[PDB]
Write a protein that binds this ligand. Structure first.
Ligand SMILES: COc1cc(C[n+]2ccc3cc(OS(N)(=O)=O)ccc3c2)cc(OC)c1OC
Ligand SMILES: [Zn+2]
Length: 257
């Protein structure tokens, strides 16, 4: 089964998921001097005031927080998007060291982690249908750098003890994802894919320019999670990131000059 090890990591995924070598794979390096400013791009509209978080879960490749997506409560619209996209979950990718961990890079610069807020296009009725469509998902990507603590992340950090190993989950209600956003919503956007299997090419990526800062004590709490299930050999959950993929016939657009 796929993972991030020497014998089952990203260089192996194409054997089980041939689309790994496709035409619009993610993540990519964002070359800031060749991205094109597009003044026709609208500002993002993030409406998370009514968000309802449900559960936090160790799925063996990351941890994720899931939201009620049975109504239009927490939605994303605007930017490069047509229509309304509902927030489903968020999760992180992080490194073993502070110099790596993000999936996207900016001028080859790696950040310590990357936050993905996953949304699906309500036109398609359910997330399983949306993953089959070129515009089915919109993932909002936020870089993390190590510096001052982010207070809005601490309630995530404090519960990770209870989901240390694969398959553990816990109630995680009343979490407000607005505490994870930078002050600016300036962004880059390009058409791309899921960065884990099944690697479906169904994603409009929206990558924010402005990182958020997190403290060294916060990020190293991420590094104490396990890939393994309970009662197996311990293998720390670090470096759960896919390296940058060829841009091929794609243009990265910027919302800002
Ligand atoms: C709600 O979770 C589901 C996710 C999915 C597929 N899915 C959605 C979002 C994903 C985001 C992913 O990560 S990322 N790094 O590209 O943002 C990786 C795999 C994903 C896979 C299918 C489902 O069946 C209908 C689901 O219902 C349980
Ligand atoms: Zn992700």
């Amino acid at each position: 089964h796929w993972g991030y090890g020497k014998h089952n990591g990203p260089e192996h995924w194409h054997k089980d998921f041939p689309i790994a070598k496709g035409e619009r794979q993610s993540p990519v390096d964002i070359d800031t001097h060749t991205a094109k400013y597009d003044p026709s791009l609208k500002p993002l509209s993030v409406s998370y005031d009514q968000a309802t978080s449900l559960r936090i879960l160790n799925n063996g490749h990351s941890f994720q927080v899931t939201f009620d997506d049975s109504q239009d409560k927490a939605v994303l619209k605007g930017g490069p998007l047509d229509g309304t996209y509902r927030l489903l979950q968020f999760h992180f990718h992080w490194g073993s060291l502070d110099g790596q961990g993000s999936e996207h890079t900016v001028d080859k610069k790696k950040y310590a982690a990357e936050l993905h807020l996953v949304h699906w296009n309500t036109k398609y009725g359910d997330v399983g249908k949306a993953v089959q469509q070129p515009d089915g998902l919109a993932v909002l990507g936020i870089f993390l750098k190590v510096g001052s603590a982010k207070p809005g992340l601490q309630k995530v950090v404090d519960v990770l003890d209870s989901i240390k190993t694969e398959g553990k989950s816990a109630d995680f209600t009343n979490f407000d994802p607005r505490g994870l956003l930078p002050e600016s919503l300036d962004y880059w956007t390009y058409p791309g894919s899921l960065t884990t299997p099944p690697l479906a090419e169904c994603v409009t990526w929206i990558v924010l320019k402005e990182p958020i800062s997190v403290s060294s004590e916060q990020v190293l709490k991420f590094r104490k999670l396990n890939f393994n299930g309970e009662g197996e050999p311990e293998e720390l959950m670090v470096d759960n990131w896919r390296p940058a993929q060829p841009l091929k016939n794609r243009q990265i657009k910027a919302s800002f000059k």
